[PDB]
Design a protein around this ligand. Structure first.
Ligand SMILES: Cc1cc2nc3c(=O)[nH]c(=O)nc-3n(C[C@H](O)[C@H](O)[C@H](O)COP(=O)(O)O)c2cc1C
Lengths: 259, 897
C-alpha cells in the first residue's frame, strides 16, 4: 500500500513518463457534477472564465437593469468602500469655506479609519485611491500605504484641501507646528494625469530654508486591489537630492559624480 | 435647597425640594430604614443598585407608605416624578431608559431588580398623579408605530394560542404585579364578567371547583390552584385571552393612546387558534370604551369554548407506565396535542398513516395545525398519540449515530417530538361535536361580532382569507376555526411585514420564536410585546422596548438577505462591467476564482495565466516539498505577471510537515515585501488559537477557509467573531464536485447555517462543488437555489471553478488526459452519492493515501485502485498477506497492464 498509493498525481501532467502513454492507467481527479459540456478542449483561460462572467453580466442587465446599460452605477475605479456616513468625528474642527477645507484635529486620538475617510471623501478620484489604499506597490512589492503614516492624525495637526470636491486640481497640504508656528509639512497634488506627487517638507535645514522630498506615484484605475504604484526609476537620487540640500547648503550644487 | 437619599455606596441621587423641609425630613427617616442593608455590591433584589433605582423606590415609599395628608402625598410624589422625568430620562420614556439601564457594566443590575424597583414604582407615581389619565401629553413619539402609521414600516399583530408555556398564570401574575394600576379596571371587570354572569348561571357547573376568584389569586400565590386545574380548558381559555388583552391594554397605556389609535398604525392582526378571537377585538376596537365592551365579549366567547369543550371530551388519566415511559424518554406528560418538529411533512404523513390503520375511526390522529414546513403538531387521543410516539422512537437517531463521517447509509432521522401542554384536542374530530352547542349558546347572548366594524383585516387560520370579506356569522366561523378546522399558519401569515408584534402568552416562547424560522431571511423582525428582557445581543427577535423609541434611527430591522446580498453591476469609466458582489469588492476582480488544486495549479505558468486573465487563483502547496523550491515557484509567477497583482497560497492542514515550512515562509515573504495576498487552509479548519497567528502575524489580505462539516462552519464563525475586521473567506464545497468530500449533502448544512454565517459581516461565502457555466451557477449568485426547498433567497458572494478549469490551454495536464475529462459525462446535483457503488459516467471514489473518499475519473488504474481497496487494502495485519499471496499472480497482471 505504500508503493501503490503514493505520489500518484503527476502522471496526468506528463504521460510520456507512463508506460506506452496510456491515459487509462493514470489517476485524474474529477468531481461527478460538471462534466457534460467540456467538448471544447484546449480553450484559453481568458475565454473559459470571462464567458461565465460575461454570461452573468448579460443576465443581470435584462433582469435588474431592465435591459439598459445606461442605468449601471458608473464608477472611476472599482474596489471596496467602507461606510462612515455621518460626520461625527471626535476631535476635529472641520470647516468648509468656499473651496478650502481646514481640518484642525483638536485633541486626543480620533478614529484613524474615520480620519482618512474625511481626508479623501465623497468622490472616487485619485485622492480617495491614495488615502484609503491598503497597499502600495514598490515594483511587485506590497508594502504599507505611506498616507497612513505621513497623514496620521497627531495632536495639533492641520490639513487644508483646496478644491477636493471640485476637480483634478486638488492640492492637499498638511501643516504642523514647529517652534509654535505652522509650517507646510506635507503637500500632495496630481501632476499631469495618472501621476501623483507627494512631497514631504522639512524646514529645519542647514541654510534655514525648507526643502521638499518629491516622491511620485502611478495611479491605475484598472486595478482596485492595488491602484497606487510608486515609481522607483529615479527615487534614490530624489532622496539624495533632498539630503544634499538639507545637510549641506542650497548654495553648493548637488554633486553625485564623485569617484 | 438639596436633599440626599443615599444607600450605601451611591450618594449621588439629589432631589431639590422646597425650603419647607420639615415634611421631607420626616419623610425619608422612615425611608432610610425601609430599604434593606447593603449586599456588598448590591446583590439583593429588594435593594437599589443604580442612581435611579434609589429615586424610584423613594417614590414607591411615599405613595405606598402614605402617612400624611393627601395634599402633601400628591405634591411630594410629583416632585420626585418631575426630578426623575427631567434628569434621568428626558425625551425617551421609562422602559427605553430601562433598556440601556439593564445593559450597564458600571452598575450590574438584573431584570427582577429593574422591574420591581424601577418599572413598578414609576407607574404607582403615575397612578396617584393623573388619576384617570385624560390629559397631560408627556408621552413621547414612539417611532416604530409612527413609521408604521405613515411610512415603509408596516406593522402586523400576532396573538398566541395555547401550549406555549405550562405556567401561563405566572404571566398574568407578573403583569398584574408590575402594572397593577394599568390592568386592574379590566381584570376586576373580567372576573366579575365570568363569575357573576356566566359561572353562577350556566346550565350546570362542577368543573370550577375552587371558584374563579381571579384577583385573589394574583396577589396571593398560596390561593392559586396548582398547574393542572389552571391548564384545564374551562379556566385556560378565558385566562389566556385575558393575558393577551392585558398585553394590549398595557401597550396602549405606556404610549397614552387609544386602542383605535394603535389600530391605524398597523394591519393584519391574526391569531393562532385561541388568539384569533383576540385578533377580532383588536381589529374592531375604536376607543377605550368600545374596547372594553368588546373585550368582555371575547372573554364570554372563550368561556363557552372552554366549558363546552370539556363536556364533549373530558380530561383523562393515563396508565402510569405510559406516563413514566414518555416522561423519561425526553417527552412530557401525554396530552392530546403532540408537536413533531424538524421532520418533513411527507414523512410524518405516513408515520401517522401507519399508526392510523391499526386504530378505529374514532381514535384517529389528525395533523391539527401546520406552523411551518418542519413544524406541525398532531392531535388525537393521548393514548393514541403515544402510539406513533413509539413508532417514531424506532426511526430516531441517537446522539452518537455519526452520519457525518459516514455517508447516507443509515436511514435514521434527526428530529424531535414532544407533547404540548394542552389538555384538549383542538382542531380535530374529537372536539367538533361541541360546535352547534356553542353557536346556539353564543346566540343566547350578544356575543356575535359585527363583521363590518372591524377596520383592519383579520386573516383566517384555515385558508388565509380575510374575515372582513366573509359571508356568514363571524362568531360562528371563529368556533369552527378552533374546534374542527386545521390552522394553516403559512398561508395565514403570507403577508409582507417589516415588523411583527406578538402579544403572546408565551413571551420568549410564544408564537414569535416558534414560527421565527418560517420567515427568517425576508426582513420581518418579530417583536415580543409582553416582556422587557433588555439583554438581546443576537438579532432574531426583539423585545417590548422596541415597540416605542423616540428617534426614528434606532429602529432595528431584520436581515432581508435578498436585498442586502443582491448581485449588482458596476461600470468603470473605461467600459468594464463588473458584478458588484462582496467577494468581487474584496479582490477588485470578477466574483469567480480558481482554488488551489494539487496537480494542475502547482505550475507557475498556469497560475500566472489565470491571474493575467483578471481572476483570482492560488498556487497549491501540495506539490511542493521544501520552502526554497516553492519560493522559486512563487517568484516564477511574479516574473510573467504584470506588477501590482497578487497570488494566493493553498496549504493543506492534514499534514503538519507542510505547515512546518509553509507558515514561516509566508511570514518571511510578507515582512520582506511580497505580493502574496491570500492564504487558504484546505482540508480542515484550524483551531482558534492557531488561526490568529495567521491573521495577525502574516501580512495577508484575506484568509481562505474550507469547512467540510457543520461544526467546522461553526468553528469558522468563532474565528470570524474573534476579530470582525478581517475578511475571512468561507469556501463551501459539498460532497459532489470536488476532488475530496465533505461527506454530507452540499446544500443541506448551508440551508441551516446561512443565518449564522451572514450575522458575521466579514465572512464571504463562496459556493463550489462542480460548477461549469454561467447558467449553472447563476441560481447561486442570486439566491434562487434555495427556492426549491421552501426557503428564502440565500445568495452567495461569488463561486469557484475547480475541475472545469482542468482542460484549459495553459493547464499543464496532458492532452490525452484533457480529452479523458471531456468524454467523462457528468451527473446532476442530486445523484452524486452513487459514486461508491458504480461509475457515474466515468467517476468513482477510492480511498486516499491516509484514507479519504477521493474522487477520480474511473479509468483502468482507478478500477484497480478501487478493487484493491475492497479486497486487500482494508484487511487486518494478518489476513492481508495471504490475500496478497492468493492473488499475487492476478495482481501482477493488473499492475503491468
Ligand atoms: C484535480 C483537483 C485537485 C484538487 N486539489 C485540492 C487541494 O489540493 N486542496 C483542496 O483543498 N482542494 C482541492 N481540490 C478541490 C477544489 O478546491 C474544489 O473543492 C473542487 O475542485 C470543486 O470542483 P468543481 O468546481 O468542479 O465543483 C481539488 C480538486 C481537483 C478537481
Amino acid at each position: 500500500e505504500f508503493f501503490f498509493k503514493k505520489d500518484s498525481l503527476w502522471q496526468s501532467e506528463d504521460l510520456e513518463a507512463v508506460v506506452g502513454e496510456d491515459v487509462q492507467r493514470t489517476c485524474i481527479l474529477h468531481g461527478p457534477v460538471a462534466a457534460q459540456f467540456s467538448n471544447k478542449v484546449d480553450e484559453p483561460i481568458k475565454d473559459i472564465l470571462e464567458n461565465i462572467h460575461k454570461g452573468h453580466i448579460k443576465s443581470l442587465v435584462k433582469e435588474v437593469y431592465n435591459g439598459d446599460e445606461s442605468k449601471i452605477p458608473v464608477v472611476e475605479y472599482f474596489s471596496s468602500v467602507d461606510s462612515f456616513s455621518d460626520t461625527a468625528i471626535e476631535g476635529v474642527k472641520i470647516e468648509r469655506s468656499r473651496n478650502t477645507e481646514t481640518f484642525t484635529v483638536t485633541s486626543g486620538n480620533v478614529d484613524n479609519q474615520q480620519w482618512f475617510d474625511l481626508l479623501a471623501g465623497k468622490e472616487l478620484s485619485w485622492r480617495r485611491a491614495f488615502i484609503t489604499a491598503a497597499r502600495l506597490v514598490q515594483g511587485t512589492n506590497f508594502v504599507s500605504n505611506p498616507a497612513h503614516s505621513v497623514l496620521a492624525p497627531s495632536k495639533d495637526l492641520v490639513v487644508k484641501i483646496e478644491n477636493g470636491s471640485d476637480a483634478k486640481k486638488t492640492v492637499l497640504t498638511a501643516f504642523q507646528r514647529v517652534r509654535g508656528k505652522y509650517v507646510p509639512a506635507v503637500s500632495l497634488k496630481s501632476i499631469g494625469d495618472l501621476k501623483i506627487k507627494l512631497e514631504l517638507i522639512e524646514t529645519r535645514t542647514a541654510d534655514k530654508s525648507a526643502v521638499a522630498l518629491e516622491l511620485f506615484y502611478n495611479y491605475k484605475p484598472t486595478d482596485g486591489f492595488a491602484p497606487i504604484l510608486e515609481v522607483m526609476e529615479g527615487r534614490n537620487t530624489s532622496i539624495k537630492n533632498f539630503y544634499w540640500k538639507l545637510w549641506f547648503g542650497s548654495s553648493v550644487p548637488v554633486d553625485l559624480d564623485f569617484d | 435647597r438639596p436633599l440626599v437619599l443615599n444607600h450605601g455606596s451611591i450618594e449621588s441621587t439629589i432631589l431639590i425640594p422646597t425650603t419647607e423641609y420639615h415634611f421631607y425630613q420626616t419623610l425619608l427617616e422612615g425611608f432610610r430604614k425601609s430599604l434593606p442593608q447593603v449586599t456588598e455590591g448590591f446583590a439583593d433584589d429588594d435593594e437599589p443598585s443604580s442612581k435611579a433605582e434609589l429615586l424610584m423606590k423613594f417614590l414607591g415609599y411615599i405613595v405606598q407608605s402614605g402617612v400624611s395628608n393627601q395634599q402633601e402625598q400628591l405634591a411630594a410624589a410629583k416632585l420626585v416624578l418631575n426630578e426623575f422625568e427631567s434628569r434621568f430620562l428626558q425625551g425617551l420614556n421609562l422602559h427605553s431608559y430601562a433598556a440601556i439601564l439593564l445593559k450597564s457594566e458600571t452598575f450590574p443590575t438584573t431584570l427582577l431588580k429593574i422591574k420591581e424597583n424601577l418599572i413598578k414604582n414609576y407607574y404607582l407615581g403615575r397612578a396617584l398623579v393623573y388619576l384617570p389619565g385624560q390629559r397631560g401629553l408627556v408621552y413621547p413619539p414612539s417611532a416604530l408605530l409612527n413609521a408604521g402609521k405613515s411610512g415603509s414600516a408596516q406593522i402586523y399583530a400576532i396573538f398566541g394560542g395555547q401550549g406555549n408555556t405550562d405556567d401561563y398564570f405566572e404571566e398574568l401574575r407578573d403583569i398584574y404585579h408590575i402594572y397593577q394600576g394599568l390592568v386592574s379596571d379590566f381584570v376586576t371587570k373580567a372576573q366579575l364578567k365570568l363569575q357573576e354572569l356566566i359561572r353562577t348561571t350556566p346550565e350546570t357547573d362542577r368543573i370550577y371547583t375552587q371558584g374563579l376568584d381571579l384577583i385573589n389569586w394574583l396577589e396571593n400565590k398560596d390561593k392559586t390552584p396548582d398547574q393542572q386545574q389552571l391548564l384545564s380548558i374551562p379556566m385556560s381559555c378565558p385566562l389566556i385571552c385575558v393575558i393577551q388583552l392585558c398585553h394590549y391594554i398595557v401597550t396602549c397605556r405606556i404610549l397614552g393612546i387609544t386602542p383605535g389609535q394603535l389600530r391605524d398604525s398597523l394591519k393584519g392582526t391574526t391569531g393562532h387558534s385561541q388568539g384569533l378571537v383576540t385578533a377580532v377585538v383588536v381589529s374592531s376596537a375604536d376607543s377605550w370604551e368600545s374596547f372594553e365592551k368588546l373585550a368582555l365579549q371575547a372573554v364570554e366567547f372563550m368561556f363557552y369554548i372552554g366549558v363546552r369543550g370539556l363536556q364533549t371530551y373530558p380530561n383523562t388519566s393515563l396508565p402510569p407506565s405510559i406516563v413514566q415511559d414518555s416522561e423519561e424518554n425526553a417527552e412530557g406528560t401525554p396530552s392530546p396535542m403532540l408537536s413533531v418538529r424538524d421532520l418533513s411533512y411527507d414523512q410524518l404523513v405516513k408515520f401517522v398513516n401507519e399508526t392510523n390503520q391499526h386504530l378505529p375511526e374514532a381514535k384517529h390522529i389528525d395533523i391539527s395545525l401546520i406552523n411551518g414546513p418542519r413544524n406541525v403538531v398532531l392531535t388525537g387521543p393521548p393514548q393514541s398519540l403515544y402510539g406513533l410516539n413509539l413508532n417514531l422512537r424506532k426511526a430516531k437517531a441517537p446522539s452518537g449515530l455519526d452520519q457525518a463521517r459516514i455517508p447516507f447509509s443509515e436511514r435514521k432521522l434527526r428530529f424531535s417530538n414532544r407533547f404540548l401542554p394542552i389538555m384538549s384536542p383542538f382542531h380535530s374530530h374529537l372536539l367538533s361535536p361541541s360546535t352547534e352547542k356553542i353557536v346556539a349558546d353564543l346566540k343566547k347572548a350578544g356575543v356575535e361580532f359585527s363583521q363590518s366594524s372591524m377596520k383592519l383585516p383579520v386573516f383566517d387560520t384555515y385558508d388565509g382569507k380575510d374575515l372582513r370579506s366573509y359571508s356568514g356569522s363571524i362568531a360562528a366561523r371563529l368556533v369552527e376555526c378552533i374546534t374542527k378546522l386545521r390552522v394553516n399558519w403559512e398561508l395565514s401569515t403570507e403577508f409582507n411585514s417589516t415588523h411583527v408584534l406578538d402579544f403572546g402568552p408565551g413571551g420568549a416562547s410564544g408564537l414569535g420564536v416558534l414560527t421565527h424560522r418560517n420567515k427568517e431571511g425576508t426582513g420581518s423582525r418579530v417583536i415580543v410585546a409582553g416582556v422587557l428582557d433588555a439583554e438581546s445581543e443576537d438579532s432574531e427577535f426583539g423585545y417590548k422596548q422596541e415597540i416605542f423609541e423616540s428617534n426614528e434611527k434606532a429602529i432595528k430591522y431584520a436581515p432581508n438577505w435578498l436585498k442586502e446580498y443582491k448581485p449588482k453591476l458596476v461600470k468603470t469609466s473605461a467600459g468594464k462591467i463588473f458584478v458588484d458582489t462582496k467577494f468581487s469588492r474584496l479582490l477588485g476582480r470578477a466574483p469567480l476564482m480558481v482554488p488551489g488544486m494539487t496537480p494542475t495549479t502547482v505550475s507557475p505558468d498556469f497560475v500566472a495565466a489565470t491571474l493575467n486573465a483578471g481572476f483570482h487563483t492560488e498556487i497549491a502547496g501540495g506539490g511542493y516539498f521544501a520552502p526554497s523550491i516553492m519560493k522559486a515557484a512563487l517568484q516564477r509567477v511574479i516574473d510573467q505577471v504584470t506588477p501590482g497583482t497578487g497570488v494566493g497560497i493553498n496549504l493543506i492542514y492534514v499534514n503538519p510537515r507542510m505547515l512546518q515550512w509553509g507558515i514561516p515562509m509566508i511570514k518571511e515573504l510578507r515582512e520582506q515585501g511580497f505580493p502574496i495576498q491570500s492564504l487558504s487552509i484546505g482540508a480542515g479548519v484550524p483551531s482558534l488559537e492557531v488561526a490568529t497567528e495567521y491573521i495577525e502575524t502574516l501580512g495577508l489580505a484575506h484568509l481562505g477557509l474550507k469547512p467540510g462539516s457543520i461544526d467546522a462552519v461553526n468553528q469558522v464563525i468563532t474565528i470570524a467573531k474573534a476579530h470582525p475586521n478581517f475578511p475571512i473567506v468561507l469556501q463551501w464545497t459539498g460532497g459532489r464536485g470536488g476532488g475530496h468530500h465533505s461527506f454530507e449533502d452540499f446544500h443541506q448544512p448551508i440551508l441551516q447555517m446561512y443565518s449564522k454565517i451572514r450575522k458575521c459581516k466579514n465572512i464571504i461565502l463562496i459556493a463550489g462543488s462542480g460548477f461549469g457555466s454561467a447558467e449553472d451557477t447563476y441560481p447561486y449568485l442570486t439566491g434562487s437555489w434555495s427556492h426549491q426547498f421552501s426557503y428564502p433567497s440565500m445568495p452567495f458572494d461569488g463561486v469557484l471553478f475547480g475541475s472545469r478549469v482542468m482542460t484549459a490551454k495553459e493547464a499543464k495536464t496532458s492532452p490525452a488526459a484533457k480529452q479523458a475529462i471531456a468524454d467523462c459525462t457528468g451527473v446532476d446535483n442530486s445523484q452524486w452519492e452513487n459514486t461508491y457503488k458504480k461509475p457515474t459516467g466515468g467517476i468513482i471514489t477510492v480511498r486516499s493515501e491516509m484514507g479519504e473518499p477521493i474522487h477520480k475519473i474511473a479509468t483502468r488504474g482507478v478500477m484497480l485502485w478501487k478493487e484493491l481497496d475492497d479486497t486487500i487494502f482494508t484487511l487486518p495485519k494478518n489476513k492481508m498477506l495471504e490475500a496478497i499471496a492468493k492473488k499475487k499472480d492476478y495482481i501482477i497482471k493488473k499492475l503491468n497492464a
